[PDB]
Paper text:
In the prefusion state, the S-protein’s RBD domains alternate between open (‘up’) and closed (‘down’) conformations.
In addition, A942P was selected for its strong enhancement of protein yields. All combos displayed higher thermal stability with only a single Tm50 at about 66 °C and decreased levels of ACE2 and antibody binding compared to S-2P control. A 2-steps 3D classification illustrates that out of 833,000 classified particles, ~80% was closed with all RBDs in the down state and 38% was categorized into a well-defined closed class while ~20% showed 1 RBD-up.
Author numbering:
A (entry chain B): 641 to 675, 689 to 721
B (entry chain B): 962 to 1147
C (entry chain C): 722 to 811, 813 to 827, 856 to 1057
D (entry chain B): 50 to 66, 82 to 131, 164 to 172, 186 to 196, 200 to 211, 215 to 242, 265 to 433
Write the structure that this text describes.
Amino acid sequence: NVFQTRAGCLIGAEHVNNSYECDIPIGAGICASYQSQSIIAYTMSLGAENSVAYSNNSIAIPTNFTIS
Amino acid sequence: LVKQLSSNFGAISSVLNDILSRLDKPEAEVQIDRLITGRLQSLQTYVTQQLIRAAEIRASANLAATKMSECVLGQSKRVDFCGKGYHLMSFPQSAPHGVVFLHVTYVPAQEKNFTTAPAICHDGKAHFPREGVFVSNGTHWFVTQRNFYEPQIITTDNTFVSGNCDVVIGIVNNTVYDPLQPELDS
Amino acid sequence: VTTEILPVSMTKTSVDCTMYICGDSTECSNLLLQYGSFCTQLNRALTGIAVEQDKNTQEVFAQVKQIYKTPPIKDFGGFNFSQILPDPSKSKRSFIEDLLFNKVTNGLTVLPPLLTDEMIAQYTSALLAGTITSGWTFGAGPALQIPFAMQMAYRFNGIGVTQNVLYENQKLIANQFNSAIGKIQDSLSSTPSALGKLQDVVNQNAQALNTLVKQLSSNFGAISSVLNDILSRLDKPEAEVQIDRLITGRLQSLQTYVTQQLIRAAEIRASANLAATKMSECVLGQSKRVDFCGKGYHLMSFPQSAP
Amino acid sequence: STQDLFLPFFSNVTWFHPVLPFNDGVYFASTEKSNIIRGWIFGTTLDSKTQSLLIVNNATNVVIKVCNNCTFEYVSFKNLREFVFKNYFKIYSKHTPINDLPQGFSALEPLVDLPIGINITRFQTLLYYVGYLQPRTFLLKYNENGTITDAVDCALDPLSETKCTLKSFTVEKGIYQTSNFRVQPTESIVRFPNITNLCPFGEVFNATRFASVYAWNRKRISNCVADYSVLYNSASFSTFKCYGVSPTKLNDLCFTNVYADSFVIRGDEVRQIAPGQTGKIADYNYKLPDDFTGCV
Ligand SMILES: *[C@@H]1O[C@H](CO)[C@@H](O[C@@H]2O[C@H](CO)[C@@H](O)[C@H](O)[C@H]2NC(C)=O)[C@H](O)[C@H]1NC(C)=O
Ligand SMILES: *[C@@H]1O[C@H](CO)[C@@H](O[C@@H]2O[C@H](CO)[C@@H](O)[C@H](O)[C@H]2NC(C)=O)[C@H](O)[C@H]1NC(C)=O
Ligand SMILES: *[C@@H]1O[C@H](CO)[C@@H](O[C@@H]2O[C@H](CO)[C@@H](O)[C@H](O)[C@H]2NC(C)=O)[C@H](O)[C@H]1NC(C)=O
Ligand SMILES: *[C@@H]1O[C@H](CO)[C@@H](O)[C@H](O)[C@H]1NC(C)=O
Ligand SMILES: *[C@@H]1O[C@H](CO)[C@@H](O)[C@H](O)[C@H]1NC(C)=O
Ligand SMILES: *[C@@H]1O[C@H](CO)[C@@H](O)[C@H](O)[C@H]1NC(C)=O
Ligand SMILES: *[C@@H]1O[C@H](CO)[C@@H](O)[C@H](O)[C@H]1NC(C)=O
């Protein structure tokens, strides 16, 4: 249970292949969090991906609103 | 700062009275000088940190004053200056050592795909929307405002003419209803 | 198409007060214990600086909820963003981001930034794709697509020019835009001094570190700047005095370094707040503030990452 | 936060139901009901020819001795009795009723301070658990009444170092830089060039004609690396002395000029070869400066 990251040696944290919003920042892209439960180290996720359906004659117009 | 009063800085004792009660003048002067050097340096470090921190706080206070002016006393166009969304208004709430703004913003919510065109051919004329966009539900064309789907029918009041059909890229075709023709006919 | 360079973050540094002062020596360390908590608050100050740097970058770039991506078909009404869009082949950086990244060149440790350059590039790609495909709507709510020519017609209305003026001059405007982007490439490629604003930052930190290390080579009045030699030549009653002089000098060198770093980090934070504001009001929307977003009536802005 | 001799948390306390070293301080607990545990001997040999502290808690009175030749004499399993013995001599104690070793926490208010300064390396009990103390930094939580209700052993594990760094007993979520790792040097290296260019004592000591005492010969030795092992390490010489140096320190220091005079003398008058020496060999032939630096 030893993981060599670009920031140094991480001992006692479980490497994971998922990616989440950064909980505890470790550095060089790596975060760690408490999630039976243990401490996991993962490359952070910049956000849920998205792709606007762009095309040269398509427009999206809101039909409702929310006051926030 | 307070803890730095317990450090010898090299003297025989951090307590000044002990040095005074245990030594004559010519030597107590040496020890007390060591203490004075240390404690003076501790004050200077404290004061420097405070100066820098106060500068940061007044930057924050100038920002808060700007938000109060442009954001509470008015309606801001500056994007994300006054919350995420199209700013509507703001309300200031006092908090210990600071302020809390409640930014009321408008967030467009439920959206649809439409087919759109930049202009409209009517009689070899190009019509552009005064304010709004041309949208097509699939079969017919309307003009709507841009931030809330509210289709009106396309008339010579929603649009203005400019040029002709042969220059714009993507122009399409419809009637452009003229409200006054029925009145001239009726 | 004008260019505006803004520093955002410094190098995160940390100094092990005791190695710097008393490097690998116990007599010195026990003499240093007498000075109280100077070392711990030096470390506290530097740590505050480093955390701040990460926050600066987070505020400038992480202003986008999702990661939008440009469609494979690039029919943007005639405009050609290929030189600012990411390069799939290459670190997925754009062409101009590559020019920029090329044109910038004891107890001390350097910490790595929390956001790697790859993630910064993904952020700016996301902002760019969102701007191109959705306009300013993606910064106010959900990204709503709109044909690029029509978005630009909106922006022309924004500066007060009727929108028939774009549709009737679309090819001419697209050509001028493409030409202007090419000139940006050339202006950066040719002269280096353009990036001085960023380069200077690096230089400053480097200088401030060299000086720090060089201060290890001063007596400050002792018989030698070599702690071991003072130790090995003199008897502890006198070695203690000489070492005291050394400790005072080196400790003051650290305090000077840390104060300079704090002031400089205040400068950088001011600049990073400016950059965040420009991102929000200038990339995510269209600005009416005069000369906030370049000389002229502002239409749109394109964010490019740089060291 | 205090740096003192304490009992590292969770350490393996030896259990007995012999003589034990004292290495640097001794915790001593005993779960007792029948009070076989009376007293203590401490010392280095506990046999005579040295001073060995004795303590007896006998049924009304606390005899305490440093014996004859006595230098001092003081006088005064539900029973969990705890004691701490450190070195002058200090004993702390405590006594709780409990119902093996109990989970919980209690401080040990001191009892006695024997200003004796004995040399102790071993000890035995006079008819229980034996722990040893280490130089540890603790973080003690003095309550409102001024009692110690919790402690933190700042080298037990990373969490304890964290808490000690913050000077707190509760840690908010985050990353904290608590210490500095250093790879220690595993060994030492001493390197210098080859050891050639020795001062030629082969001309002074390996000669063939020892000149007159009155006309004694004086040759120079300098600009070399003078071996100092051979002269003082050979047992051939019937006399090797020096008057200004440690003759077992010559293989370190360095000198500007070395002079070597040789002479033949009577064995008896040999003593006259010294700084501050009197006699014909000492005055009329060869006088050594009263502060002469060198060797004979
Ligand atoms: C597309 O637009 C046409 C406008 O002509 C819509 O047709 C009208 O629909 C309403 C309700 O469906 C009827 O009451 C009208 O009589 C229709 N008018 C005509 C001329 O057809 C049509 O509904 C729109 N499409 C959608 C999906 O709403
Ligand atoms: C939109 O409407 C115009 C009507 O003016 C159409 O233009 C005519 O198109 C036909 C065939 O393309 C030509 O023979 C006529 O000479 C055109 N007249 C004019 C005035 O342009 C145009 O084709 C329509 N658009 C589409 C896509 O059908
Ligand atoms: C967008 O601009 C780029 C300029 O870099 C064009 O790329 C050049 O295209 C020509 C012909 O397609 C090639 O001969 C060059 O080698 C290309 N250079 C590079 C650097 O790619 C690109 O073609 C333009 N897009 C369009 C649609 O014309
Ligand atoms: C808009 O959303 C609200 C809920 O937020 C809903 O009650 C209302 O019916 C919606 N309007 C339309 C036209 O769907
Ligand atoms: C518009 O269409 C695209 C694909 O045709 C789809 O991904 C998108 O969700 C649609 N928009 C809405 C609001 O449903
Ligand atoms: C829009 O793109 C489609 C691709 O299917 C193309 O056929 C059409 O001609 C384009 N319209 C314009 C105005 O370029
Ligand atoms: C201190 O001891 C008294 C008993 O005399 C008790 O009333 C009080 O609660 C104690 N204080 C604390 C903080 O436990």
